[PDB]
Amino acid sequence: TGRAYNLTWKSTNFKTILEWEPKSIDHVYTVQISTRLENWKSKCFLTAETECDLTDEVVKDVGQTYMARVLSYPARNTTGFPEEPPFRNSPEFTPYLDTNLGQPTIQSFEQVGTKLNVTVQDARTLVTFLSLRAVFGKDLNYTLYYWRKKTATTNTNEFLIDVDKGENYCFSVQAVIPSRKRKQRSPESLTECT
């Protein structure tokens, strides 16, 4: 037939890509997206690649549920009765729930005697750009892991806990959206020590 299989979504911080199989020299692929509000619309036209970046379409509204499909077309006019293009529908995808949280980044830190202070860099995504805080608001929290492992939490991008001067601390941060049932946490960031 020529139909694609293994249609899977790859998304982290709203940067979204559809991937599939098989890699072919015999066929090219056309990719379409749709919602319950909008009919199929082509984004990738006759490509030989096996992935398509759909970030700009899903960000129109990250609260909607989307579906994509891969249409296959011969690459190398065989009859005067051309067949209907074979297609494969992808699984459903709801951006705000399904995208993975990306590894955070400690943009700054310092210990003011008995005051340890850490600042998390503001996560964005190259689309304009789309900010994590601009989407999630109060739903996005951060956890701080620290040893000389205890854990602090915050609703903003700033941490300020108490430490004993002279002491040396090591810590790492992690993004968390507690209202999620799965995909609640991101990987821990690189560790930093005072």
Paired with 89 in beta bridges are 69
Can you tell me whether residue 60 is helix, strand or coil?
coil
CA distances from 47 to 19, 25, 34, 40, 72 (A): 12, 11, 19, 17, 10
Domains identified in the chain and CATH numbers: 1-98 (2.60.40.10), 99-191 (2.60.40.10)
| Technique used to solve these coordinates | X-ray
Enumerate residues 6+ apart whose C-beta is below 8 A from 181. Answer: none
C-alpha 70/C-alpha 89 separation (Å) is 7
Are 140 and 175 a contacting pair, CB within 8 Å?
Answer: yes
Burial 87-126 (b: 16+ CB within 10 A, else e): ebebeebebbebbebbbbebeebebeeeebebbbeebebe
φ, ψ of residue 138 in degrees (nearest 5): -70, -15
Can you tell me whether residue 185 is helix, strand or coil?
strand
